RNA sequence: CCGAUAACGAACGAGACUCUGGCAUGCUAACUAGUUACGCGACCCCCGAGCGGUCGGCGUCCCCCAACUUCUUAGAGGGACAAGUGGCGUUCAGCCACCCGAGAUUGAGCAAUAACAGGUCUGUGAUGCCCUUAGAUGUCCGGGGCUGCACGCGCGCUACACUGACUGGCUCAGCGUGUGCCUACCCUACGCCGGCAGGCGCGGGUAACCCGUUGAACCCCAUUCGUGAUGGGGAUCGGGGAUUGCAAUUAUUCCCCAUGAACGAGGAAUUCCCAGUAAGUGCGGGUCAUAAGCUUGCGUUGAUUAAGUCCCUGCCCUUUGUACACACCGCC
């Protein structure tokens, strides 16, 4: 158990889907890359923690509105 | 085929009932040549089912402090053992180990605080991980207080005790253990 | 007592007792507790969980 | 096929030896072997009474091993658990004075010789004898 | 379970009793043939090598420990 | 050759004032005799050259009476001077080694001899208090109540 | 039939245990720090030693030529450290000169046996804290 | 020490910081002692950021 | 006159109780008549669908 | 965190972060780490094995006289995110199972608002006040004491044994220390003498260069013992011999030979603990002229049970009551 996003990570994801939604895709690494040059994350670990949940928003985004 | 300890080919042997027959692992899947090795088979729940019953028994008999880590004696004791039952019985030792396994473990128990007030020892049915726990347990212990103040070594009280228990004779400590949790169940079912 | 019933079919009674509580025994028992102000005004009795 | 003690049981090649060091009566073997405990940390006196060719077999093929070693060394080898009584165990080291005689016993037999530095290695003799028991006794665990 | 002083050495009625009837069961070890014939236990060991040299038992196991016999085969 | 009882058997034999049970190997039964430990017990016999693999009652009379010789007479039977009890006497000066109930009184009289000239070890061993300076503190309520 | 470089070097370790297992073209031996595998220390886990020949036979490792050299832990992970980097050798021998056709047909036989085999055990050791006798035993509290 | 405190956090804020915090502890004028804390701005206390964000006498 | 042993397949975990969480309780099917499913209390590792030994049939487990 | 929602947007703490472990046959490299290949050797070989086998034997930065980084070291980078699949879930947050994968929960460090009249004035040239200050409560020197024993309690060490003890053989580590401002005290290889603790010469190391391939214990394999307070246990005590120290008695420590006491698994109770964990087992650091049954780390062997609950014990939150607010150690 214990995979539950912090409010920090949750809202660099939102943020940059908002502004960056046509430079993103569904693949995990692509997003991870794009999420280099796109924003500034000093820490790998919440570099690929955001590019995560950007995936598993933009999936749930493709097929149906959420709060984003 | 796999020779177990170099022989006592485990393609024979059987399992009698359906309860225990997926948490035995003698088939040629779980069939190893030597009951050693660094399986993690306590990393997460469910995960010791598949952990061969010759490993688990090996494992479940370095007890009580003075031996604790040494596995390749309690190895070495299985092997002989082995050796043991086989020559005094002619089938073989994981027909017999497998039988008397079934016959330890204790088919029911009791909560024995189903009443937290005060104790009224409701009757409870075990799950089939459980009797494989209790009845390993049971001829472990009973092997180990055999051999405890008597010229018998350990090898050969842990033979004994297994054909003991394989066929059941009110002188199996596990058998007796077993006939006590059922009579006791019985008493307030 | 159904199977040991002579009848083949028997219905088992029921015991009606109504019961009269001070509000110290009826604390104690557990049979009422204390509600938020806003919480004492609410006269409905407290549903059954039947399901 | 050539056999070399790596290739052989250590424990029949050592007995092996000291039977041979046991039959060739010429190993120089000090008077007090027979009072003495092998080390230290031991209680008792070793049950074998030729434990001295057992411990010279042991360290002709330790040096064959491993060449370069003193007496210090060996000690390392041959030392092991004291039980200290009531305090608990520790390592202790094995007898300097077996160590040494072992070792001029085997320099005597022309067998072992001082090295360009420190410690004693075997002699091209010594090695050749080590080779040739190590192939009668493959040849006897063998059949 | 008081004691059990068991013999140091063969009698007449024990040295012949293993001659004639420990090789006929199956199970030979040191432990069960010495509380079975009241003998010590190095008597036991000492006696069983003897009997594996004279050629009436055979040697399964022999380890330092736990050393196993059993008796001819028969057929 | 673990046949019958060999008709020259001893199962209780008496050296010096003690008995030997016979049944023991030799050299793990004469340490039943004071002042002869397993170390003493093992040179002794080795020196005598007698089979250690047999019993105690497997000696005969004159192993037996031989094995007696030689513990009384250590010096002379070439034993290392510092495998005795009483090296360096402190009433003679003589190197010897004690077997009986002679250490029994010697130990006496060394226990006096203290106690005499009223040295510490003599007043603590008389008021029967630990003598090589440990801590009575918490330990030693056993031999007291 | 006289043809030169040709040869791995793969190793396998587990508990600080290290064995790097040198693979050559020549006949069928292996060899563990000059010695026999049969002549192995722990004689009573030496059919872990000699198991993964059992598996795969004697016919591939028969092309082969096998000196492993070992250093650090102790006599099981050593024993472990060498049939871990004995199977990891030839395996990975054929991937280098033969088609991995081959080594598919016997990876899969070493994973569905013992994972360990190809793959290293990651548990090492955990450190002690300054409360207790190891990594998570505490010294024992009294109240009264 | 409520003046001089507040008059060094003012002096603070003005060079320019995220926050700072002043904490004086001790007796004055009574045997009690009391401790005040003056604080403003954002102030960190865990983590590696602390050693290299955080200048403390 | 004496109920046989038989044996029962898991069905589905219902979840722990007795107050400790010593033993959880389960719905059981029979397999000699698959259409009888009750509810026993049992005791170790339990998961679904694997199968456990019953001494009698009628009694239903209620909680505790 | 998601959702309901007079809240919206935040901040501290949690998380994030630093260190550590786990994978990189990818990169940069290494005579203070090596490995392969080759050249001489030493031996077994000869049935002949012959690009045969072993070698911690010597060499190929003895710089012209091989290559390379797999093993080792340490830098930069990569790599894991609930990523993919299936199921559950308001189908949200997330949870379970599986695949591939080194790893699908590696351990710590740091750690809020505040409180505890918690501990420390015997850590300090931190410190207020009080005391003492020449027959000193300053300071030095000598001796003693801090160890003293009818008893009670706490942390522990060793054991009660054959799953063992003894004897011998085989055989594997990693942390990590090492010659000094004052400061006097280092780690030790090798040879010689003794049985030992030790002594004497010859060196090396201010250190990946030497100890040291740290040849550790446990364990493994053979011998004896044989259920007996026994070859378990080694308390108590006598005699002797060394080492450090100016000084060893009230034994500093160690060594040898003697005696051999309780202890036959422990009542009421009670402690610690979830994977390289407990436990068995040794080894370094601190303490140190001499010193570990302590502590702090490290390595070796290596498990049983569990993936839950509020029953016991506590703690937190909400509601509630209050004549308390120095806050129940209250008020009265
Ligand atoms: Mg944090
Ligand atoms: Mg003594
Ligand atoms: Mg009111």
């Given amino acids: 158990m214990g995979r539950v996003r912090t409010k920090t990570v949750k809202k660099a994801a939102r943020v940059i889907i908002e502004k960056y939604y046509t430079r993103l895709g569904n693949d995990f690494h692509t997003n991870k890359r794009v999420c280099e040059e796109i924003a500034i994350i000093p820490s790998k670990k919440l570099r690929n923690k955001i590019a995560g949940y950007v995936t598993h928003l933009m999936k749930r985004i493709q097929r149906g509105p959420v709060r984003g | 085929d796999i020779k177990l300890f170099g022989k006592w080919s485990t393609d024979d042997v059987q399992i009698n009932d359906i309860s225990l027959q997926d948490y035995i692992a003698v088939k040629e899947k779980y069939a190893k040549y030597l009951p050693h090795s660094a399986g993690r088979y306590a990393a997460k729940r469910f995960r010791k089912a598949q952990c061969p019953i010759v490993e688990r028994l090996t494992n479940s008999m370095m007890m009580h402090g003075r031996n604790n880590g040494k596995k390749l004696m309690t190895v070495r004791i299985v092997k002989h053992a082995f050796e043991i039952i086989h020559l005094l019985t002619g089938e073989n030792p994981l027909q017999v180990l497998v039988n008397a396994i079934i016959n330890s473990g204790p088919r029911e128990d009791s909560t024995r605080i189903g009443r937290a007030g005060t104790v009224r020892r409701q009757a409870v049915d075990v799950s089939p991980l459980r009797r494989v726990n209790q009845a390993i347990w049971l001829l472990c212990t009973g092997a180990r207080e055999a051999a405890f103040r008597n010229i018998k070594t350990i090898a050969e009280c842990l033979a004994d005790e297994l054909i003991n228990a394989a066929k059941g004779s009110s002188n199996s400590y596990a058998i007796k253990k077993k006939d006590e949790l059922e009579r006791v169940a019985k008493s307030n079912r | 007592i159904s199977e040991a019933s002579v009848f083949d079919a028997y219905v088992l009674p029921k015991l009606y007792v109504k019961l009269h509580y001070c509000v110290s025994c009826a604390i104690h028992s557990k049979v009422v507790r204390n509600r938020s102000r806003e919480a004492r005004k609410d006269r409905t009795p407290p549903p059954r969980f039947r399901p | 096929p050539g056999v070399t003690v790596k290739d052989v049981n250590q424990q029949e090649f050592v007995r092996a030896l000291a039977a041979f060091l046991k039959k060739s009566g010429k190993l120089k073997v000090p008077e007090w072997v027979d009072t003495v405990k092998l080390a230290k940390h031991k209680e008792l006196a070793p049950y074998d009474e030729n434990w001295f060719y057992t411990r010279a077999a042991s360290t002709a093929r330790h040096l064959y091993l491993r060449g370069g070693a003193g007496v210090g060394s060996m000690t390392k080898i041959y030392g092991g658990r004291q039980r200290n009584g009531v305090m608990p165990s520790h390592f202790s080291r094995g007898s300097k004075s077996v160590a040494r005689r072992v070792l001029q016993a085997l320099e005597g037999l022309k067998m072992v010789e001082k090295d360009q530095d420190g410690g004693r290695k075997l002699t091209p003799q010594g090695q050749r004898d080590l080779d040739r028991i190590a192939g009668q006794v493959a040849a006897a665990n063998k059949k | ?75 | 050759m673990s046949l019958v009882i060999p008709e020259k058997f001893q199962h209780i034999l008496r050296v010096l004032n003690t008995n030997i049970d016979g049944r023991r190997k030799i050299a793990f039964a004469i340490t039943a005799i004071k002042g002869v430990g397993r170390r003493y017990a093992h040179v002794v016999l080795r020196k005598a050259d007698i089979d250690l693999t047999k019993r105690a009652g497997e000696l005969t009379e004159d192993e037996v009476e031989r094995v007696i010789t030689i513990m009384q007479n250590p010096r002379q039977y070439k034993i290392p001077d510092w495998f005795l009890n009483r090296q360096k006497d402190v009433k003679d000066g003589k190197y010897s080694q004690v077997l009986a109930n002679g250490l029994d009184n010697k130990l006496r009289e060394d226990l006096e001899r203290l106690k005499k000239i009223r040295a510490h070890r003599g007043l603590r061993h008389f008021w029967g208090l630990r003598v090589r300076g440990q801590h009575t503190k918490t330990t030693g309520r056993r031999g007291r109540t | 039939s006289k043809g030169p470089l040709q040869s791995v070097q793969v190793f396998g370790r587990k508990k600080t245990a290290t064995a790097v297992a040198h693979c050559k073209r020549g006949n069928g031996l292996i060899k563990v720090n000059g010695r026999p595998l049969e002549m192995i220390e722990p004689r009573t886990l030496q059919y872990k030693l000699l198991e993964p020949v059992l598996l795969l036979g004697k016919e591939r490792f028969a092309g082969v030529d096998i000196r492993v050299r070992v250093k650090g832990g102790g006599h099981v992970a050593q024993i472990y450290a060498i049939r871990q980097s004995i199977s990891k050798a030839l395996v990975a021998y054929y991937q280098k000169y033969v088609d991995e056709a081959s080594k598919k047909e016997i990876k899969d036989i070493l994973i569905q046996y013992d994972r360990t085999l190809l793959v290293a055990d990651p548990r090492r050791c955990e450190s002690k804290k300054f409360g207790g006798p190891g990594a998570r035993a505490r010294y024992q509290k009294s109240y009264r | 020490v409520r003046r001089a405190c507040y008059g060094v956090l003012r002096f603070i804020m003005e060079s320019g910081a995220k926050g700072c915090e002043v904490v004086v502890s001790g007796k004055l004028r009574g045997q009690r002692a009391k401790s005040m804390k003056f604080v403003d701005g954002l102030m960190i206390h865990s983590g590696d950021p602390v050693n290299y964000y955080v200048d403390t006498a | 006159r004496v109920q046989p042993i038989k044996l029962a397949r898991v069905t589905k975990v219902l979840g722990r109780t007795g107050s400790q969480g010593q033993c959880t309780q389960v719905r059981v099917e029979f397999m000699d008549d698959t259409s009888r499913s009750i509810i026993r209390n049992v005791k170790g590792p339990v998961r679904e669908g694997d199968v456990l030994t019953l001494l009698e049939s009628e009694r239903e487990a209620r909680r505790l």
């Fill in chain 5, 1 to 75: 379970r008081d004691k059990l002083n068991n013999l140091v050495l063969f009698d007449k009625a024990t040295y012949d009793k293993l001659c004639k009837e420990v090789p006929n069961y199956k199970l030979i070890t040191p432990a069960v043939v010495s509380e079975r014939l009241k003998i010590r236990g190095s008597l036991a060991r000492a006696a069983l090598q003897e009997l594996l040299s004279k050629g009436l038992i055979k040697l399964v196991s022999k380890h330092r420990a736990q050393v196993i016999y059993t008796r001819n085969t028969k057929g």
